[PDB]
Enzyme design. Structure first.
Site, PDB file in Angstrom:
ATOM      1  CD  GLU A  35     -16.097   9.799  27.279  1.00 16.97           C
ATOM      2  OE1 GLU A  35     -16.582   9.289  26.245  1.00 16.97           O
ATOM      3  OE2 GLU A  35     -15.462  10.882  27.269  1.00 16.97           O
ATOM      4  CG  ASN A  46     -14.123   8.122  17.435  1.00 15.88           C
ATOM      5  OD1 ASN A  46     -13.160   7.575  17.956  1.00 15.88           O
ATOM      6  ND2 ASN A  46     -15.167   8.545  18.129  1.00 15.88           N
ATOM      7  CG  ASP A  48     -10.571   9.415  13.594  1.00 10.81           C
ATOM      8  OD1 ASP A  48     -11.356   8.557  14.052  1.00 10.81           O
ATOM      9  OD2 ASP A  48      -9.526   9.749  14.190  1.00 10.81           O
ATOM     10  CB  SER A  50      -9.997   6.188  15.871  1.00 16.05           C
ATOM     11  OG  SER A  50     -10.806   7.277  16.278  1.00 16.05           O
ATOM     12  CG  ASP A  52     -13.984   6.739  21.206  1.00 17.05           C
ATOM     13  OD1 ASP A  52     -12.809   7.067  20.949  1.00 17.05           O
ATOM     14  OD2 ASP A  52     -14.985   7.356  20.784  1.00 17.05           O
ATOM     15  CG  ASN A  59      -9.671   7.593  19.686  1.00 17.77           C
ATOM     16  OD1 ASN A  59      -8.678   7.832  19.022  1.00 17.77           O
ATOM     17  ND2 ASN A  59     -10.862   7.457  19.154  1.00 17.77           N
ATOM     18  CG  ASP A 101      -0.609  13.270  25.942  1.00 18.88           C
ATOM     19  OD1 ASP A 101       0.458  12.668  25.706  1.00 18.88           O
ATOM     20  OD2 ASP A 101      -1.218  13.937  25.077  1.00 18.88           O
TER      21      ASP A 101
END
Ligand SMILES: [Cl-]
Ligand SMILES: [Cl-]
Ligand SMILES: [Cl-]
Length: 129
Positions: A35, A46, A48, A50, A52, A59, A101
């Site tokens: 990562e 990203n 979209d 967003s 990280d 994110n 989650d």
């Protein structure tokens, strides 16, 4: 801060990540390697819109607030900047929520693609832990 491999393993263990939700320490170190290359200051934008953040590339769509991700949530209740600190506490505490989650470490696409099913213990080999 760019952590050493064993240095990060030790910090993660210190913060209770070792075997958290059944994921051995090597899984977490492997995820961080791919990562962020162990760099707490890593950021990536990203498609979209967003972003990280940090050693585990958490994110802003769901987990932290950066003020520039429309329609997003802040489920870890932290500014995304907290995920860039030399102190990994915020990243670890948030990662604990993420991995709980529902989909385990599959939440980290890079873990799924590069760590899952591999000899992850290699990532902590030799480490005084
Ligand atoms: Cl391991
Ligand atoms: Cl936002
Ligand atoms: Cl990937």
């Amino acid at each position: 801060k760019v952590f050493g491999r064993c240095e990060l393993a030790a910090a993660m263990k210190r913060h209770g990540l070792d075997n958290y939700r059944g994921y051995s320490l090597g899984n977490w170190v492997c995820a961080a390697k791919f990562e962020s290359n162990f760099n707490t200051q890593a950021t990536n934008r990203n498609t979209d819109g967003s972003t990280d953040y940090g050693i585990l590339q958490i994110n802003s769509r769901w987990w932290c607030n950066d003020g520039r991700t429309p329609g997003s949530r802040n489920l870890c209740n932290i500014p995304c900047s907290a995920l860039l600190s030399s102190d990994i506490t915020a990243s670890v505490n948030c990662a604990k929520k993420i991995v709980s989650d529902g989909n385990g470490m599959n939440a980290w696409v890079a873990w799924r693609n590069r760590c899952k099913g591999t000899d992850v213990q290699a990532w902590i080999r030799g480490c005084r832990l």
